[PDB]
Structure 1
Amino acid sequence: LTENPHKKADMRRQDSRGNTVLHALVAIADNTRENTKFVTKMYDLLLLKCSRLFPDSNLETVLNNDGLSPLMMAAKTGKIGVFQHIIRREVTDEDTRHLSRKFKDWAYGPVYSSLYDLSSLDTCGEEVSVLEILVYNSKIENRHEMLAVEPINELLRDKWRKFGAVSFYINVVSYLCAMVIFTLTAYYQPLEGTPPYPYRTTVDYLRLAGEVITLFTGVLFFFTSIKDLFTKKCPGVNSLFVDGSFQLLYFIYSVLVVVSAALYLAGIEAYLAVMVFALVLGWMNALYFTRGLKLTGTYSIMIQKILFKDLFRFLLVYLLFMIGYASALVTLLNPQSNCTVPTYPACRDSETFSAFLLDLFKLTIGMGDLEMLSSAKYPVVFILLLVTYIILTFVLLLNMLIALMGETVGQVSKESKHIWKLQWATTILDIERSFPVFLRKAFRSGEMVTVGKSSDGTPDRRWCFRVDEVNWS
C-alpha cells in the first residue's frame, strides 16, 4: 500500500480523530512481549519509510485532535514498550538518522556518553511535555515504570541537584517559619480579641511584625493557588486538584486567614475561633510535606488511604455497633436527686434526652473500668451481654487491626518507594512550574547543526541530556 503503482496511501494521512498511522499503532499496543515487539518493529518501519518519502518533516510530529504525539500518546495511555523504544531510538543511515533520540556523543574505550535527546520530554511549559503528562496525570496505569525509563529518571535527578533540592528546603523552612510565626501571633493575640492599635513598644512591634508576615504568607499562598487554578494546560489534562489531595488545604487555610482578618477588623467575640482552626489545618499541611529525600515517613499514603478508604467505613460500623449496644443496655437498665450532672442514673426510667444517657454510657465503656456490681438487680443477662461486648471488642479489634498491620507491611513494598519517587517528581516539577523555567536554569544543550539537527523539538540545537555509562563489550 505504500508503493502501489495505483492510488497511493500516504502515511501522513490521518483519520477523523487525527490519529495517523503511528497514533493508532500506539493505540492498539500493550505491555506484552509479542505485541510490543511487532508494534515497535512496524513503528520503526513506518517512520523510516515516511521519512524517506518526505524528508521535509518528521511523521511523528503530526498531532491528533487532542494535540498529542505518538510518544506523548504512549505516555498518556500508559504504553511502556512503545514509550521505552521511542525514547531510546537511534538510527544509523544518515538519510534517516536525523529522527533519532539516543545519539552517541563520544567513547573512550569502555565509557560511552550517550546523549538522549529530550526535545519533547520538557518544553519549559511552552508546549505540553512528556514528563508533565507522565507524572502529574494520576490516571496513568504504569506511571512509575515509565517514570524510570532512562532519560526521565536521570532528568529528575539532575533537576533535583539544581534548583530542585535547594529550593525545596528553602520553601519548607520558609513555610515552617511562617507556621511558627502564625502560632506566636495567634498565641500572643491581645487578650479576648480586642484588636487595638497599640504598636508603639518593642514587643508590640514584634507582634505587629508577626501578624503582617503571617498575612503576607497567607496572601502569597492564595496568589499561588489562584495562579494554579487559572493555569490549565489542556481540558481533560490538568491539575484539577479542587476537592482532592492537598491544594484544597492551602485554599481553606487562606480563606480562614482572610475571614479571620475581616472579623478581627470587626473584633467580635467567639468568631476568632477559626484563627486557631486555621492553625490546626496549617500544621496538618506540614504532614503532607516531608515527601522529598531521606526515605520520608510514609504517613501520606496512609492518610491518603485512611481518609476515604476501608478504615472509614470500618470505624463507621464500629460506631454503629457500639451505639446499638448503648441503646440496648440503656433500655435494659432504664428501670432521690443523687446530685449528678446528668439527670439520673436510670432511677425507674427517669429519661430526658437520649444523647445524655448515651454519652454517659459511651464514656463509661470507653474508660472501661469502675464496673457495675451492685446486688440482685435483674438476672445475669446484662453482665453476660456486657462481657461478650468487651471480649469481642478487645479481641476482634486487636486481631483485625494487627492482621491489617501485617497486610499493609507486606503490602508496603517497592510500591511504597514508588509513591515516594512519584512525590519527589511532583515536588521537583511543581517547584519548576512555580517560577519561570525558561530562564537560564534549564537542562543542558548539545549539538547545533547537521549531525545534531532535526525537526523533532526546539531548533536544530536539539536540547539534549547526556548520560554517561560504562559497558565492557
Structure 2
Amino acid sequence: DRDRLFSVVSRGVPEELTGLLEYLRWNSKYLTDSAYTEGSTGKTCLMKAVLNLQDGVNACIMPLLQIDKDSGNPKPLVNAQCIDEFYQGHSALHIAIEKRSLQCVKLLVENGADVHLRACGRFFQKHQGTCFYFGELPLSLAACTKQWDVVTYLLENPHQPASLEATDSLGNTVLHALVMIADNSPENSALVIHMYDGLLQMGARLCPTVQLEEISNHQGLTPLKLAAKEGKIEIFRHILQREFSGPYQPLSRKFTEWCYGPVRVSLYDLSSVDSWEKNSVLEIIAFHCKSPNRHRMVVLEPLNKLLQEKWDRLVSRFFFNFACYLVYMFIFTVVAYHQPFGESMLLLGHILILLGGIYLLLGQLWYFWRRRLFIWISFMDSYFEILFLLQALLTVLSQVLRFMETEWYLPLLVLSLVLGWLNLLYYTRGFQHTGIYSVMIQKVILRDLLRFLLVYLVFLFGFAVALVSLSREPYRSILDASLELFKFTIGMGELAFQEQLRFRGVVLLLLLAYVLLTYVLLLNMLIALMSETVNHVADNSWSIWKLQKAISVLEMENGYWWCRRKKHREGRLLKVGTPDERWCFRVEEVNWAAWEKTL
C-alpha cells in the first residue's frame, strides 16, 4: 500500500493517479492486504488522513471516500488495523468526531459506519490506558466533548439514527458516561450539566416513549444512583432538584407548585425512597459510596428533610432500644458485682445475660450478613458496630466457660462488661448538637493515636530492655521494666538503688532520655490532633453527624431480626398529581428573593 506512505501532502493529483494505477493492486490484493495489517505503518491510514489539520479549515477533499468505494472488500469497517495498535477500542468514527469536523462524519455515516462499536481490549484502566473513559460509543464521545452539532446529526441520521439508549460492554449508557466525567471542577460541572439537560430534552423530543433515566448498567445503577455512588455532587445535586418549564416540565423532578407568600412548597419527586424497593439512593450514599465528600450529599435539600422526617419517626424506637440496652447493662453490672430467693435471682440474672448476649450476637451476625459488601470493602467507617459483636461474643463465651465449671470465665465476663460499658457511648450519635464534636473525633483519633501509640510502645519496650540489661549485673523481668517505664511518665520508680553496679549515672541519663522522648511524643500528639481541627468545624462536622444519623435510621428502619423485616411501610406522601403520577415529598422553604426578582 504505497498510497498511504505517499499521502503526506493534503490532497492532489498524486493520490488520484496512485489510486487509478492500483485499482485493488490489479485484482490481486495480496500485498495490499499484507500492508493493511500492522508493521507496514503501525497505524490505520484513515487516522493519518484525518488530522491533516489545515490552519484555515479542515478540508474534506482527501480521498477517504473514493478509496472506501474502491475497497469493496467484505470488511469495509472503518476501524484500526489489527483492531489494536496501542489504541485498543479506537475506530475512525471516534477520531473523526474528536476533530470537531462535521464533513467527515457527515460523509462517512452513509457508508458502513457500524454504530454501537463494541470493541475488544478492556486492558489497563477502563478500556484503554491513555484513552479516558467516554463510554465506547460514538454519540457518547460526541456528547462528552461538548459538540451539539454532531450529537444532533447522530440522533437523527437520514439513513439510520444512533439509538440514545445504546449500551457498551460495561452496561453504561451515554448518561452514565456523563456522570463519570462529571468531576467537581466548575467548568466540567457546567459542561456536564448543560449536556445532560440538552440530551434529556433531545431524548424527550425524539423518543418520549421510554424513560431515559431508568436504564441501569450491569451493576444495576441508574444515572442518579451512579452519581450517588461515584461521589459526584454537582451532577447528582442537579439531577435531584432539576426543574423545567414548558413542554419539558414532565422531565423535571421538583415542582414549585404553590406559594402563598415568601414561603413556597416544592414537590420533590424521589426515586431515593426505600418504600418497597431495594438499592435506594439513600443506602447507596450511606453504605456503597466511598467518596470523601459523601457526607455533604445527604444535606442538599430533599434528602435533608427526608432524613429529618425519618429520624423524627424512628426516634421513639431509638430511645426504646437505648433504654433496653441501659437496663440490660445495669442487670449485667449487678450480676457481675454480686457474683460470689437470692440464688433464684442470681440464676435468672445469668439466664437473662446469656439471652441478651445471644440476641446481640445474632443481631450483629444478621447485620454483617446483610452488609457483606460493606465489610468486604471497608468496615472502618462504622467500627463501633463490630465492637458490639465482640462484646456479645465474649459474653456468650463467658457463659460457655461458666458452663464448663472452670475458673477462667471471670476475665471474659469482665472484659464483656467493660466493652459493653464502652459501647454504651454508641448512642451519643443522636440527641442534639452535643454529638457534633463527638462524631468527627473517631475519624482522626483512630488514625493518629494508633501510629503514635505504636511508636511509644516501641520506645517503651526498648527502654525497658535497656533497663533490664543494666539491672541484670530492681527491673527483674521485661514486664516489670515495661511497667516501670509506663509509670515513669507520671508516677516514676526513680531514685536508683544506691550502688547499681557503678551504672547509676547511665541509668539516670537513660531515664531522663525516656522522659524527653515521652514528652516530645506528647507534644507531637497535641500538634497532630490540633492540625486537622481548624479546617474541620466549618461544615464538615454537621455533615458527618447527619451521615451517622442517616446510617442509623436506615439500619433501624429495616426492623429487628426478631421481628423478621417488618413490611417496609410509610411511603412518604404516596402518590400526588404531577399523565404520569409519581410519589413526591413536599418541602416548604421561605425566600424573599422571589418577590425582589418576580414582580
TM-score (norm 1): 0.82
Distance 1:401 1:243 in 2: 23
Compute the displacement of 1:54 (Å): 2.3
Contact conserved, 2:254 with 2:269, CA < 8 A, in 1?
yes
Which residues of structure 2 form unaligned runs of 5+? 1-153, 595-599
Higher relative contact order (CA 8 A, sep 6+): 1
Distance 1:467 1:58 in 2: 26
Greater displacement, 216-225 / 40-49: 216-225
Greater displacement, 173-182 / 284-293: 284-293
Contact conserved, 2:471 with 2:500, CA < 8 A, in 1?
no
Offset from partner CA, 1:115-151 (integer Å, 9 cap, x none): 0011x11233522111110122351232122111110
**2:269 maps to 1:117:** yes
Distance 2:283 2:273 in 1: 8
Aligned-residue RMSD, C-alpha: 3.0
Compute the displacement of 1:274 (Å): 1.2
Aligned length: 433
Sequence identity, in percent?
39
Contact conserved, 2:240 with 2:253, CA < 8 A, in 1?
yes
Contact conserved, 2:254 with 2:268, CA < 8 A, in 1?
yes
**2:534 maps to 1:396:** no
Contact conserved, 2:439 with 2:544, CA < 8 A, in 1?
no
**2:253 maps to 1:101:** yes
Distance 1:186 1:395 in 2: 39
The residue that corresponds to 1:180 in the other structure is 330
Distance 1:66 1:160 in 2: 30
Query: Aligned pair in 2 of structure 1 residues 238, 171: CA closer, same or farther (>3 Å)?
Result: farther
The residue that corresponds to 2:478 in the other structure is 355
Q: Which amino acid aligns with 1:180?
A: F
Query: Aligned pair in 2 of structure 1 residues 357, 206: CA closer, same or farther (>3 Å)?
Result: closer
Q: Which has the larger radius of gyration?
A: 2
**Among 11, 16, 26, the residue aligned to 2:164:** 11
Q: Which amino acid aligns with 1:310?
A: D
Offset from partner CA, 1:57-105 (integer Å, 9 cap, x none): 21110110000001111111011111111111122234x4322210133
Distance 1:446 1:437 in 2: 22
**Among 444, 449, 452, the residue aligned to 2:573:** 444
The residue that corresponds to 1:224 in the other structure is 363
Distance 2:498 2:218 in 1: 80
**Among 353, 356, 365, the residue aligned to 1:214:** 353
Query: Aligned pair in 2 of structure 1 residues 128, 470: CA closer, same or farther (>3 Å)?
Result: same
Query: Aligned pair in 2 of structure 1 residues 239, 291: CA closer, same or farther (>3 Å)?
Result: farther
The residue that corresponds to 2:77 in the other structure is none
Q: Which amino acid aligns with 2:537?
A: S
SS of structure 2 residue aligned to 1:464: strand
Offset from partner CA, 1:154-182 (integer Å, 9 cap, x none): 1111111222x222111111111111111
Distance 1:13 1:283 in 2: 56
Which residues of structure 1 form unaligned runs of 5+? 192-200, 336-344, 347-352, 455-459
Contact conserved, 2:484 with 2:492, CA < 8 A, in 1?
no
Q: Which amino acid aligns with 1:444?
A: L
The residue that corresponds to 2:395 in the other structure is 257
SS of structure 1 residue aligned to 2:292: coil
TM-score (norm 2): 0.65
Query: Aligned pair in 2 of structure 1 residues 443, 206: CA closer, same or farther (>3 Å)?
Result: farther
The residue that corresponds to 1:368 in the other structure is 492
**2:309 maps to 1:158:** yes
Contact conserved, 2:274 with 2:280, CA < 8 A, in 1?
yes
Q: Which amino acid aligns with 2:586?
A: R
SS of structure 2 residue aligned to 1:31: coil
Compute the displacement of 1:387 (Å): 6.1
Distance 1:321 1:48 in 2: 66
SS of structure 2 residue aligned to 1:162: helix
**2:544 maps to 1:406:** no
Compute the displacement of 1:46 (Å): 1.1
**2:558 maps to 1:433:** yes
**Among 276, 279, 297, the residue aligned to 1:128:** 279
Query: Aligned pair in 2 of structure 1 residues 53, 360: CA closer, same or farther (>3 Å)?
Result: closer
